């Protein structure tokens, strides 16, 4: 029920639509162009990408941060 102390809500992940639009760029030619840097770790595959931050990228379940 409603207690005296406030409670922060859980991390409700907002649904993002048409994410498959935002992975590759499509031109008149059939050659694709990836928009994200690829993770070279052997735990994940070659189809996964990295996170899109504003300073540096971030891998998936590998949780490895690579600088420049």
């Amino acid at each position: 029920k409603s207690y005296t102390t406030p409670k922060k809500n859980k991390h409700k992940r907002k649904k993002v639509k048409l994410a498959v639009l935002k992975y590759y760029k499509v031109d008149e030619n059939g050659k694709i162009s990836r928009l994200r840097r690829e993770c070279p770790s052997d735990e994940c595959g070659a189809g996964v990408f990295m996170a899109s931050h504003f300073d540096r990228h971030y891998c998936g379940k590998c949780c490895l941060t690579y600088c420049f």
Binding site: L18, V20, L21, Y23, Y24, V26, G30, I32, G45, A46, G47, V48
Partner: protein
């Protein structure tokens, strides 16, 4: 060839040679392991169709055309329950990569010779 698609879909279901999900399909094309692909065309999408043959028709890719999304989803069995009637709630699937390992069958040679030309 519809019964060939039925028998290869039941072979994928019986041998776990299916990876349902279009980003799993993108991972399968990125890992260079795609053999057979099923495409959905002339369905209810404004922008999804251009990306789906853009990311499907890369190299060594078979082309199968399905008129409606829901008929492929009912066929693949996303919610395949209550066979004494109809499945309850199945959404329409569009793209799937058949990464099957079972090869020795009856219609496998027929569908491979149909797709080889």
């Amino acid at each position: 060839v519809n019964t060939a698609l039925q028998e290869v879909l039941k072979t994928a279901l019986i041998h776990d040679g299916l990876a349902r999900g279009i980003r799993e399909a993108a991972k399968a094309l990125d890992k260079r392991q795609a053999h057979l692909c099923v495409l959905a065309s002339n369905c209810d999408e404004p922008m999804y169709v251009k990306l789906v043959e853009a990311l499907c028709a890369e190299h060594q890719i078979n082309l199968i055309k399905v008129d409606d999304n829901k008929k492929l989803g009912e066929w693949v069995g996303l919610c395949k329950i209550d066979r004494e009637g109809k499945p309850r709630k199945v959404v329409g699937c569009s793209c799937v990569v058949v990464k099957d390992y079972g090869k020795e069958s009856q219609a496998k040679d027929v569908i491979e010779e149909y797709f080889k030309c």
